[PDB]
Amino acid sequence: QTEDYCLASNKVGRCRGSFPRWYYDPTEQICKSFVYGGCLGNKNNYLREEECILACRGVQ
Residues at the interface with other proteins (CB under 8 A): 12, 14-21, 35, 37-40, 45-47
Q: What is the DSSP string of 38-52?
A: SSS--SS-BSSHHHH
Report, in Å, the least distance between residue 19 CB and other proteins. Answer: 6
Give the integer Cα–Cα distance in Å for 20 and 36.
Answer: 6
CB of 2 to other proteins, least distance (A): 18
Residue closer to other proteins, measured from CB, 42 or 60: 42
Query: Min. distance of Cβ 60 from other proteins in angstroms?
Result: 24
**How many other CB atoms are there within 10 angstroms of residue 29's CB atom?**
12
